[PDB]
Amino acid sequence: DSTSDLIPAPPLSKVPLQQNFQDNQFQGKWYVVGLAGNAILREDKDPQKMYATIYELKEDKSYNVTSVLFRKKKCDYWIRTFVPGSQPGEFTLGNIKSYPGLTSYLVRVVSTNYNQHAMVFFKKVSQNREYFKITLYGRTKELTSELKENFIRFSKSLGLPENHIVFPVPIDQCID
Ligand SMILES: O=C(NCCCN(CCCCN(CCCNC(=O)c1cccc(=O)n1O)C(=O)c1cccc(=O)n1O)C(=O)c1cccc(=O)n1O)c1cccc(=O)n1O
Ligand SMILES: [La+3]
């Protein structure tokens, strides 16, 4: 029982796909240097801490994806599987049945140079509500003003206001 009001997910026609996606070069550790989405809210009481996501390419060409977060003085690990979709750089969540209320989960790599930065679009339908987010990944915990401005411009092109765009604060715990 609830009421919720969400910015509509953009059509996938507004979400570019990285041309010539190289699955092997996308592997390894990425820091989440920016987050934007219809359920992302800027919060000054506890500013969002940086977390890291590790992509491991399996023999079957799916990714094992592990996120590491620092929560309540401990390292929290979330492991899931990204299964190759219709085109290189697109994925769906493996074993969708195992997530209560989840009916769809889509991943699209928008842009990357593999060795510094990536932007990744996520869309999911959970309890019949449609959520989307854009993750700005860095190989380091800092990125240039130009890459952050490009991320803001792309996020606003998908209908997100300033207060749905956050830059998690770098930490050392868990993600080094
Ligand atoms: O709107 C989105 N995200 C921003 C709000 C995050 N949040 C704020 C506290 C969440 C803290 N955790 C979650 C870590 C553990 N999670 C899970 O065991 C999990 C199970 C099933 C589906 C799923 O998605 N997760 O994460 C993250 O920091 C975290 C790290 C890495 C990847 C990641 O995805 N998350 O969230 C939410 O509670 C939330 C609200 C609405 C939808 C939603 O999926 N989540 O997690 C969104 C849109 C489209 C796809 C998508 O996956 N997400 O998250
Ligand atoms: La999530």
Numbering used by the authors: 2 to 177
Original paper wording:
The mammalian protein, siderocalin (Scn), binds siderophores and their ferric complexes as part of the innate immune system, and has also been shown to selectively bind a diverse range of Ln- and An-siderophore complexes. Scn is capable of specific, tight binding to a wide variety of metals complexes with natural and synthetic siderophores. In general, the binding of ligands/complexes in the protein calyx is driven by electrostatic and cation–π interactions, particularly by interactions between side chains and ligand aryl groups. Although perfected to accommodate hexadentate ligands like enterobactin in three pockets within the calyx, siderocalin manages to bind octadentate structures like HOPO by distorting the coordination environment of the calyx only mildly.
